[model samples]
Target: AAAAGQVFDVGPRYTNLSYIGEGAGMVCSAYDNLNKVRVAIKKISPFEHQTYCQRTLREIKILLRFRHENIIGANDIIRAPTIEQMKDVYIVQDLMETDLYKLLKTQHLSNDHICYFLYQILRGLKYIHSANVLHRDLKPSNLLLNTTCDLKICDFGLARVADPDHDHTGFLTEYVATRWYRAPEIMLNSKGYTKSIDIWSVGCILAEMLSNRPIFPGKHYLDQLNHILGILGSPSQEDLNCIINLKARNYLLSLPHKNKVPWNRLFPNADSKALDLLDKMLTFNPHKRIEVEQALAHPYLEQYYDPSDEPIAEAPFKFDMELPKEKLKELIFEETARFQPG
Candidate 1:
């Protein structure tokens, strides 16, 4: 199954390739012969399963709908030779040098570096939230970085559009964000979560960057909640009331009370402004957590915040998450056709 020295015939425009990696799908670094630039091509088998099909469709639609500097939009979607023969979809995108996860493990980042990275993340989140979409999954590995420290948020597989008019908890998947970076509200099984969930992830990521390790590296979901409560302290009775899951709320009530750890103690070398913003971003109550706009305006990111350049989606992204596999395949082909030469 290794593709080390193999040449892929996914599309005519892509040639001279080297395999990258794979999980849900395979990726390869290829020279875009037509565009005369290097690009990363992701091969996704959409009909693998209902979930895989949905994710593939969602990611492609979101990439096409949203356009932002800190967001990874598709450069092109290689068309299949024929609609009837379409099974695998190849999406061409900008090839980033490495991800934040690798950077955090290999390099020491200065305060300025952290600030710029956080600023770009929040900036991207603002645009995404504006479109009534929740990234659902936000982690360092999903954030791609270049030599210039340019960070772009990627992997919209678990992302979903939040319908303002309805209760979103009914539609959202509980198994979205990675455990350590997941918001407490999600762990507590809150009735529903807002875009603030993404804000919490940013807090965890920022803390990791500051300390060079994950702040809440839990072994499992249960341990994950404990890790969060241990540091952030047990949620108040008021916060507990917000949790709709009776078992989860009662479980917290049964636990011994824990005191909140001061941010200064947790991040001794961090700037005061950074600590202040972290606290707001990691609030136990999702409703009380900082909003993207507020975080952008916070003192910690003032140096990089630019109102004029921070743009939002012109219209809410329209999505249908429950379409049948046949319909999804049809839609996928329609999106793929957009990138084809007329």
Candidate 2:
């Protein structure tokens, strides 16, 4: 849908609260006027400096198709109420109290907690994949942890619906996921990937939850790839059978040049169950990668999750529960000539 522009008199009932924070990528704040709801707003640069803006619009549309308990919800597409705004396009979603990144920075995650965290994200991915959408970009930053301990899968800017007939979207080998979280296929430029690419991200998130930091240490793309290969060993001939010309298929297949700490050494305190799960999630082959449905139903979630409990905090501005009525007559037309009826 094209954006709408006109000040929506949301009325004094809903207050535009103060800004909580702002980043070049997005902005969020509390909405005090109507029950004080918090809202997160993300804008695409009108200049189209980033080629991904259109993809973002498509993401918002896909997210609208889903409404699961674990998934973060999109509240509004704020094209209305101010065309004069510098950026012509902006999307608003429910504001979250905090994200998993903040949690990892502050506290250590117990084995049970790690399972809980991992399960939450897996459940979310299951929902998305069930809806036939691929979250091409999955990472710690995009996963929001609400007050209630719910990990919401969000930030679908790079998400897309892969052609069921063909998973390869472009010729460029560069993976779409964040550097450290990228899958082996993506790292090696392997083609014909399914939703399994996200499984690698799950591995990264699991490692972080257990150790309280990123699994693979690298500031750049190549370095991150090196880190993954180092610990996992270069993709083997068997692993390459699914991918095209899997690198290092021939000999030594030396460990990636990065990965300063070994996986076992980093999470020595983690439970055996947690370690095994991580190992499976991080496995090299995308075809044999864990499926979301199976992961969600795994012992991890069943053992650690409590289905009856309510989330500590709900997202702000849940319009599905209460959407504002748009009084068509009250709408202001920019030019009266367009509305001059006989």
TM-score of each: 0.93, 0.74
Q: Best candidate, lDDT-wise?
A: 1
> Mind giving the per-residue lDDT tens digits that candidate 2 earns over 286-335?
77777766666566567745434323222221111011112211121121
lDDT of all predictions, in order shown? Answer: 0.83, 0.60
TM-score of 2: 0.74
Clashing pairs in 1: none
For model 1, give the RMSD to the true fold. 2.6
Error of 2 at 249 (Å): 3.8
Residue-level error in angstroms, candidate 1, position 307: 1.3
| Backbone clash numbers for all candidates listed | 0, 9
